[PDB]
Amino acid sequence: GTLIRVTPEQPTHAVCVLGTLTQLDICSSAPETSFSINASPGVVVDITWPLDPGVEVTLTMKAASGSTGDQKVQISYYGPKTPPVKALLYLTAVEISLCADITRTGKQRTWTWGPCGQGAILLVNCDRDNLESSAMDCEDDEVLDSEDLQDMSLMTLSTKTPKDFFTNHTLVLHVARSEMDKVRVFQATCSVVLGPKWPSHYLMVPGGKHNMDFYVEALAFPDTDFPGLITLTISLLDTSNLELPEAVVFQDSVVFRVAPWIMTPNTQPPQEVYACSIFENEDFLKSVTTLAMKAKCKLTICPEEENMDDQWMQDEMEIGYIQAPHKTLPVVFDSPRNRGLKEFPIKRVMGPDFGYVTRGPQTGGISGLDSFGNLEVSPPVTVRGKEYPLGRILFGDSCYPSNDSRQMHQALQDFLSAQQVQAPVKLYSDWLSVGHVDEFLSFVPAPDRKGFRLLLASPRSCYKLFQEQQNEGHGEALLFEGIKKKKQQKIKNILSNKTLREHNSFVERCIDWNRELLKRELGLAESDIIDIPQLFKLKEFSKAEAFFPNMVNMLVLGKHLGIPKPFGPVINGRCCLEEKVCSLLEPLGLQCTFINDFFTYHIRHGEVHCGTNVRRKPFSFKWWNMVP
Amino acid sequence: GTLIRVTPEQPTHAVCVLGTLTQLDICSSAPETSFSINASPGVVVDITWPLDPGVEVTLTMKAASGSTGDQKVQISYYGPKTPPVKALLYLTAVEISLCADITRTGKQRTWTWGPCGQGAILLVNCDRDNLESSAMDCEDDEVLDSEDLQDMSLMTLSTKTPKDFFTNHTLVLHVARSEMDKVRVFQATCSVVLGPKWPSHYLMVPGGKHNMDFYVEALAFPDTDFPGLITLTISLLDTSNLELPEAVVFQDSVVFRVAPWIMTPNTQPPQEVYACSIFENEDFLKSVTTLAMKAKCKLTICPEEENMDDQWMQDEMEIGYIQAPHKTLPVVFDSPRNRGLKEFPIKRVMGPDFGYVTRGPQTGGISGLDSFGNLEVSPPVTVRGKEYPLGRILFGDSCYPSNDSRQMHQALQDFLSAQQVQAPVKLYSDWLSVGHVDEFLSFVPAPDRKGFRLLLASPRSCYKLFQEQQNEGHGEALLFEGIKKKKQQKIKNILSNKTLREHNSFVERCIDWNRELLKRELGLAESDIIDIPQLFKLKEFSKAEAFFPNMVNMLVLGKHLGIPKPFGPVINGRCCLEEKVCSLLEPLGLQCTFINDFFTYHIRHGEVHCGTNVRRKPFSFKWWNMVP
């Protein structure tokens, strides 16, 4: 909006940017009734008229000016006995449009969510396209590679003005000091114009028709102190007066939203599997390699030289992605646990079209619940009307905070919440010794229902299984048959052990709490849930450990499952625990491969899921079309 | 929600909290068809029934139990040729309700805005009821005075259980580690139970009927890293097993929202006026004292001994308020400018039922735009449908950030935005030497329209005024008549000064920018706006100063106005600038008192508004009934 004050004493000169509201104040400086307006064909004047303040006179140009003051407006002040007196207004029309991908196709003043919403997307340039280097591309203020531009968002300044227009006018591009530390802008028309150091920059633009392309990168993900919006503004400045300060004639903006980090649940097709080569574990890696081949996945193994004897590939990282209309890339969330695998995410997971992010204190102040076996996501779900088309992040906690209770670090929690798009749900995992949600739950694909099943570890199911076997006459059947370096236990002695039953009743109560929590927060019914037979035992600090290899802690590669080999009671030639799991999962079209991880992973308090990790296909559903 | 697993082998014992959903799993542990349910009169069982997993059996008690397991449920498993087998369930019903003022009358699981919304209000205990002390009441972990409890929110735990119920159960009250630094909870049943040090506390509660009152205080206002919500939770713990860990049976919560700091516009009735006694300024203080008496306001004067020669009472502080259903108190926002008045807000503005808050760096890194003459609020307005019933905060900025541009510190900006309820609007004030929005705008009450008028300083109006006087033959009339220690200037020489006209055209352009900005963001029309004749001059760095005493910079005490005496051209016995202002404002029923502030305030680049401050009545509209 602009109000031009015309005067019969002196002629007025003004600039009009196309698509803006221009109005005239005719009365204030009028002499002493009545007035009439006559304008050149290029000016459309909407409103033989009385001199009354309330009469709105609005002007709109249709095209940009060829020369300065080429459009005219003439206001004639007259009266009953007064010859007309003329006030002149010389107009110069110009086009000044700051353009971006606001429709989100790859080509209001606010950013709005949803399929009918508007607002451009910005990716955090957190990968490393630069060949042979250490830092992320966004850590410096240069565009080192042409491929790097593919990660950036295009913004174009289009101008149509007279040839001499920028003799007396100047354009300045700017971003608030609040947001300058989170964005960098390069001029292509690459050299930096806006960034952490510079909040504003004078643009060198020639008169006539011109197009100036910019490439923009984000430097920070959404977080506690960053909602995730970045506004870039162009200002047209009148610099006609050599002694007076510059005056702003017109401002226009584009609002960018920084793309969130997004996780992928087990129901998303796998693309790449990760694992470690360690102590005598060659046969474990054979089984995983075969499983990866069956699921047609790329396979990456971290060797002992880089491992520092850290076998827990699940725990150091989580592989997610970031997504814009023009570019989608995987992004590794590096856990602050910083064990032997500390460098793996940095050295050769991060790279060309593979982003990096980390959170929390790096030198200490961490717990086991910061290991990313404690970080998972559900498949897409709808909870009492509200859609979660990218699912819901799940992470483990205590039921309330005490001196002995553990939590995932608040910096990690806050980051996950600030991504917004997978609204995190706190589960109860602190009753476990290790304390990870993957120790009692998993998700698998399914051909019916909601496209999945929630698997939960279940003492109830195992007691039921073992009692059925004893009822059928297999009381002597031995748990841990096949393991020569351990004392076997008969089904009858397992069932008669009152303390083991007490322990498992408490664990059942802990899992049941999570069951109902998941049913409420994911909108699940019992028909979505399958119980996996699993016994537990309480050890140090009354914390739960797996009695036999924790079968729910499995590697899910599409319909191919890598399940820990339980070494259960062999009845009719086969482990009754394997047969039970097969009977539950084979009807869903899942293929169960039981992997021997006993002396390699199990005895060190983890299983197949703990020893591996997976990169999965990003969702086809675009995050910005959600309404969180 | 809770799912109790019944069994014919062993009887089940369980607790049921009234108002919770309890269901039975009858099939999982059923022997081998059909089943029937019979329960005691206290148990209402909703659902001669087949053993099919999908059959929902839900139980609800009507009243709390007198003794442990006093309610019974009997599930009879039978078949075509099978005598019935019984599974027993012993139920204990208890009431556990955590109550607060969720309806906001002073007496879902989320906090919702609006008159049909729910959620309790928490005040930040930032005043000082403790007689003879320095710190705010919330800085320690004790309730020192009985009056202090009036600022706190009441929360009551009501329980109805068997007499021996807490032999095997325990209640724990807790708040997340995330929020514990922002709240403190005292047990009245005063001693602290939750706070910055303690996130949880075991409650000592006797069996039977009991009521436990708590008093809660907030320790922080809403801010960048604090949305303003605090959740307090009660957990019922099963401690029946001396070797097993405690197990959670039931959790319930109350969500508090911390009350925002709220400003009061000039259209709110004044209650107390502030000023300084300094160099020869006794006559200035007489005029203000008389004005305060006319508006029936309390008067507070900071003496020279405390001033340290700092006369700018407007700049060091802003007097707002905080509001809850049970308590409303004024709260002083202390500016970080920390000039001679540094201590005034701390020493005897803060006190009994007078809160304190401050923001920004205290030892340096500040600008003139952090002075609270640059912090104002509009009256209530509705902008294209959206109501702002508490108005909109206004503060001055530049049009874009450059090396020479100034801004209010981001910490102050962020705080104001985080209060949410008066959605701040950035204006353009940096063109002024001092740089304050009060230098070019004010608001006054009005009996018609929206209940107010926006006053804007206007060179246009003054040139028009002076030209009319010259046309009527008063060209010799002297600006600064009555001032013996300054050179007078004739109306004809003022009008013929081309450089003065150039300067004022630029200033007019700066004010016009704000005019349209205010029209858009406050929904104003021209009929809401009155121009006040005012000339300006550019000095150091081409920054604007008032040519004669800045009349818009006035003290607004209801219908009584304290306007700077312009000492304009005397025509027909009276200053033509005074007569013009009177002609504009007297029709609104405003009383104009022109105060001589020339050699006291004006020559030091400020006026009557700058030298004073006002505490005003809080809005009757309750902030929580807004939908921001």
Ligand SMILES: *CC(=N)NCCC[C@H](NC(=O)c1ccccc1C(=O)O)C(N)=O
């Ligand atoms: C399911 C899952 N993510 N598990 C990870 C938990 C296992 C590791 N284990 C160890 O650190 C450990 C335990 C005993 C002996 C050796 C080792 C080891 O050095 O790997 C954990 N607790 O984090």
Ligand SMILES: *CC(=N)NCCC[C@H](NC(=O)c1ccccc1C(=O)O)C(N)=O
């Ligand atoms: C309208 C308003 N809030 N004005 C405050 C601006 C005036 C003060 N003035 C001074 O600091 C000053 C200027 C010249 C000579 C002495 C003094 C003084 O020490 O008070 C400001 N610029 O903050």
Ligand SMILES: [Ca+2]
């Ligand atoms: Ca770069």
Ligand SMILES: [Ca+2]
């Ligand atoms: Ca890149």
Ligand SMILES: [Ca+2]
């Ligand atoms: Ca790490």
Ligand SMILES: [Ca+2]
């Ligand atoms: Ca790339």
Ligand SMILES: [Ca+2]
């Ligand atoms: Ca994980």
Ligand SMILES: [Ca+2]
């Ligand atoms: Ca206290």
Ligand SMILES: [Ca+2]
């Ligand atoms: Ca108090």
Ligand SMILES: [Ca+2]
């Ligand atoms: Ca201060």
Ligand SMILES: [Ca+2]
């Ligand atoms: Ca009080």
Ligand SMILES: [Ca+2]
């Ligand atoms: Ca103020």
